[model samples]
Target: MVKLAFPRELRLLTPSQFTFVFQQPQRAGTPQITILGRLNSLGHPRIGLTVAKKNVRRAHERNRIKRLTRESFRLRQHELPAMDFVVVAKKGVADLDNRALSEALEKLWRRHCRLARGS
Candidate 1:
């Protein structure tokens, strides 16, 4: 099976290209963002990638996180809209253990109670 890697087609490559789907309630979708309509510069979606050398020191580590995050997304993708999500890896991300990382990703999904339906 072909896992969904970075697809060249779905990328919010520009600073102005990002969009915040705010105002949607828990019943609607995930209504919690750092600041409603306010997106972190690093959180710009580029085909579901969380790439940054700062977050992970080695390519293996970075790829590992990507795999974990992608696995989580794979399960939830059906419930989610077609939106390209860009998950930010905070400074401490690399410090987190595998279990911690898993917890974090699941928490993110749970926070957005509703399906993240956007394309």
Candidate 2:
């Protein structure tokens, strides 16, 4: 099996790219994770992260959440649709353990990418 790196090409690098998703995204929300997604012309998926300081005060904590989110995105990229996604961290996200976070992310990804058209 080949390793699929999260390359720069597979990242929402600009404000415009992020806004494109924000403008009209298919949203999936839980108490902890809010996934915003938009279909992209590129035949692959990309991701952006938004972790508010108010929700997660510590910088390290925010970074940890991003790491988890990005790692989840990376591993599940092939299974995801061709869209731009923004994973927003909510208030209770920092309290979740790795298993909980992964489960939550898996659920969000499934609902966001698989059921995206229904939204």
Candidate 3:
């Protein structure tokens, strides 16, 4: 059986890890959400998240966005390239419903897959 779990190893934990992806990263997504990625030495992909209070406003909304993003990433982790990814939320992200947000993330992830293939 395949392991489709979201383990700690699959997360970008440190500030330096997040910084690495922020620098000269391949970018995707729209005004509401931006998915930035950078090639990593690790054999597996890792993810980081940034949903700022200034951007999303409410705490619950921020949590909700993070939860949905995490779930999407977890399910598609195997299909993604071995890179560090950071999901940044913009001002309008809080307005998007869960289904819309999930679809948006799916589109962004698909774009990243294409990018990985090109490189």
Candidate 4:
């Protein structure tokens, strides 16, 4: 099997897009998270994570959290259906280690399978 890497375009990067992902988008939930996701006509299936500075004051600490998140996502990239995912860290995420992170991510990935259109 090919390794799953997040493509450039699928990154939930912009302020507006991030806003929409959290604020305006419909959502789904599994055991791990309440996901904010929507289909993109032009963008391929993608995922993005937000690790705010307040979550960890030090740059190194914040970066480390993001690295863990990315690693977990990379390992489970093929598990989700085709759509974009944006994860906003909830209260307990900063405390999670790699193993917990992986399990949480896989559960979140499993929640987005519902088709938006009734076709």
Global Cα RMSD, each model? 11.2, 9.1, 8.9, 9.3
Q: List clashing residue pairs in candidate 1.
A: 81-116, 81-117, 83-118
**Candidate 3, overall lDDT?**
0.73
- What's the ranking of the predictions by TM-score, best on top? 3, 2, 4, 1
Each model's lDDT comes to: 0.48, 0.71, 0.73, 0.55
- Decide which is better by TM-score, 2 or 3: 3
- Best candidate (score: TM-score): 3
lDDT of 2 at 108: 75
lDDT of 4 by residue, 30-91 (tens): 42234566544434666676656565555665666567556755776555446667765554
Clashes in model 2: which pairs? none
TM-score of 3: 0.76
lDDT tens digits by residue: candidate 3, 46-99: 668887788898788788888877888788866777667777878888887767
- Candidate 3 residue pairs in clash (backbone atoms < 3 Å): none
lDDT value, candidate 4, whole model: 0.55
Model 2 per-residue lDDT tens digits across residues 40-107: 65665777888888878777878778887888777875667776777777788888776787777667
User: How far out, in Å, is residue 85 in model 4?
Assistant: 2.4
Residue 53, candidate 3: Cα error in Å is 0.3
**Global lDDT of model 2:** 0.71
Worst 10 residues of 4 by lDDT: 110-119
